[PDB]
């Protein structure tokens, strides 16, 4: 289960970080080079099978990574993300035992690589299923292995946010930014070359007279992006940073020093749910991967419990889909909080052993009553911390003020926690 | 204020680029007639007539010009004073700005030679 | 079978008040500073705009 495949599968690993340990800004150089790569990585593929729909999970799928039928971004970091998540599951859930020898953590990274590359191969096979099928597979793995190396050289390396989450964040910055300035529009019944940019809604004032019907197309534009959409997008950003500052303060007499009070906080977003939203995303990505195996042996009847109902009309033609979608969103993020905290740290025993491990004792009571001091916060500030993100992303969909939705709310939440992490070392 | 300088350098490539060809607007780049086989490959900057441009020609020219000037701004505003990090940040600044200066002038020299057919 | 619902709904209204609810100062700092940090990651899309579609014209045209 672990003792056999892991010792053989060691083929082509990564090089661990050097002895140039403490530095400020060459850290940021190792970030920026990867950001040059994902300038470059979102670029066009070499095969001319020009299929009509771009991707089938293109919208939710697009929210996670937006190079749908596009570049070497490979339709998602969904290999590394899904393969990381179920790995940490099956380490934390004791279906498979825990490895804490350094050989076992190294081969744990090896098996991480294994499931990641196998899932890349799975996505490759499932998107390509003509006679031109050569060398696509070679390209994808080469560009799967590259994202692998760039992520694991930004965990043991620079890594502060992750490799992963800041990729998602910057690509979400771009997906707002193509909506920010928009050069082309294929010409409709009138009005070429203006699609939901503010330049579009400044060139539109230069072309057309009757500025009332220049305002109306600027603020109630439907098929292209909208500027009412952009107001709602800004509005969501403001509210979500209103809710990041929700934090619980706990003051701490440090042990053996008179009265320094570096109060440990607990923010509600609670790792900003980069598990828990991607928990909400990638299960609904893996079936819309595997509906391709449903074509043989669908986008219709399976969709009614699969997706949002996509309609600005709140009383659109099915309340079943709306109710089940919202209830699944809320329950999914709450449930994956109350299951998530037990593995990636900051559960009750986690916090207790970190604070004893860094000599910080609550004033009110004895050291190992700190558990019962804070066990009445962390699950609820998991669960509510799950819950009122997903309902928050309901407000990211219910009102279309989001450039990309849920995912953009949450990748900028990644950025907001990210700023704290960078600031920490000042 | 210096925002007026920002306004002017904003206006710079804006009226170097295409205000002249706002009303005389000529669409971006396609002019090949199969050349022997392949029909409508978009060509280039215009070359045969000198005064004309397209939208894609002008924007590129404007971009080349303001980056060079603001590279000299960066030479003035930070590289001559001595206050910040005296071995790491400064060396980056002279490095990328000298790269800006040299490769910019080189490529604009190329983008007058190849549309222009001038003896170099 | 009904009471854990009561437990969690009262449990929420506990920890909403215990949180500190930031005011016009820290909100201001992370607000402006992190929209700035956003646009640090942001204009990068305008530079794949300025680059990777015209070089895709170079790609398809040749």
């Amino acid at each position: 289960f672990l003792e056999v495949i892991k010792p053989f599968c060691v083929i082509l690993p990564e090089i661990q970080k050097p002895e140039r340990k403490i530095q400020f800004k060459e850290k940021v150089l190792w970030t920026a080079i990867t950001l040059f790569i994902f300038l470059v990585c979102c670029q066009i593929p070499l095969f001319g099978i020009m299929s009509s729909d771009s991707a089938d999970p293109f919208y939710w799928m697009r929210v996670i990574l937006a190079s749908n039928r596009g570049t070497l971004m490979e339709l998602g970091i969904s290999p590394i993300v899904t393969s990381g998540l179920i790995m940490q599951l099956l380490a934390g859930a004791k279906i498979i035992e825990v490895g804490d020898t350094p050989k076992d953590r190294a081969l744990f990274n090896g098996a991480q690589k294994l499931f990641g590359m196998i899932i890349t191969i799975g996505q490759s096979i499932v998107y390509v299923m003509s006679g031109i099928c050569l060398l696509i597979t070679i390209q994808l793995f080469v560009a799967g292995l590259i994202v692998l190396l760039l992520d694991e050289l930004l965990q043991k390396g620079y890594g502060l946010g992750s490799g992963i989450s800041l990729f998602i964040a910057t690509n979400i910055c771009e997906t707002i930014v193509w909506k920010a300035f928009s050069p082309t529009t294929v010409n409709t019944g009138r009005g070429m070359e203006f699609e939901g940019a503010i330049i579009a809604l400044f060139h539109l004032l230069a072309t057309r007279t009757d500025k009332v019907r220049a305002l109306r197309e600027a603020f109630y534009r439907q098929n292209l992006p909208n500027l009412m959409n952009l107001i709602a997008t800004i509005f969501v950003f403001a509210v979500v940073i209103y809710f990041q500052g929700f934090r619980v303060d706990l003051p701490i007499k440090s042990a053996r020093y008179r009265g320094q009070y570096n109060t440990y906080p607990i923010k509600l977003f609670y790792t900003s749910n980069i598990p828990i939203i991607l928990q909400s995303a990638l299960v609904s990505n893996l079936y819309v991967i595997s509906q391709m195996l449903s074509a043989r042996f669908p986008v219709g009847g399976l969709c009614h419990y699969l997706s949002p109902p996509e309609s600005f009309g709140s009383v659109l033609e099915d309340p079943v889909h709306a109710v089940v979608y919202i209830v699944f969103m809320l329950g999914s993020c709450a449930f994956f909080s109350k299951t998530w905290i037990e593995v990636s740290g900051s559960s009750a025993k986690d916090v207790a052993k970190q604070l004893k491990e860094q000599q910080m004792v609550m004033r009110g009571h004895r050291e190992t009553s700190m558990v019962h001091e804070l066990n009445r916060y962390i699950p609820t500030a998991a669960a509510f911390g799950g819950l009122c993100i997903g309902a928050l992303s309901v407000l990211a969909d219910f009102l279309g003020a989001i450039g990309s939705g849920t995912g953009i709310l949450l990748a900028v939440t990644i950025i907001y926690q990210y700023f704290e992490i960078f600031v920490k070392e000042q | 204020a210096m925002t007026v300088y920002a306004l002017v350098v904003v206006s710079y490539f804006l009226i170097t680029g295409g205000i002249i060809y706002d009303v005389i607007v000529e669409p971006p780049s396609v002019g090949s007639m199969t050349d022997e086989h392949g029909h409508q490959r978009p060509v280039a900057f215009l070359a045969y007539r000198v005064n004309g441009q397209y939208i894609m020609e002008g924007l590129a020219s404007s971009f080349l010009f303001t980056m060079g000037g603001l590279g000299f701004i960066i030479l003035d505003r930070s590289n001559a004073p001595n206050i910040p990090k005296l071995n790491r940040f400064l060396l980056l600044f002279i490095g990328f700005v000298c790269v800006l200066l040299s490769f910019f002038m080189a490529r604009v020299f190329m983008r007058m030679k190849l549309p222009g057919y001038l003896m170099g | 079978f009904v009471e854990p619902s009561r437990q969690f709904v009262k449990d929420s209204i506990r920890l909403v008040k215990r949180c500190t609810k930031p005011d016009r100062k820290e909100f201001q700092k992370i607000a402006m500073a992190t929209a700035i940090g956003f646009a640090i990651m942001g204009f990068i899309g305008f530079f794949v705009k300025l680059i990777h579609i015209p070089i895709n014209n170079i790609i398809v045209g040749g």
Partner: peptide, 29 residues
């Protein structure tokens, strides 16, 4: 990255894509 070749390796991969993209397109038009 004790070494910088992993980056260089990525650059090589893009070049392989970059050059090999137009390399087959050489014989076409």
């Amino acid at each position: 990255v004790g070494p910088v070749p992993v980056l260089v390796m990525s650059l090589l991969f893009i070049a392989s894509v970059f050059m090999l993209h137009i390399w087959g397109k050489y014989t076409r038009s």
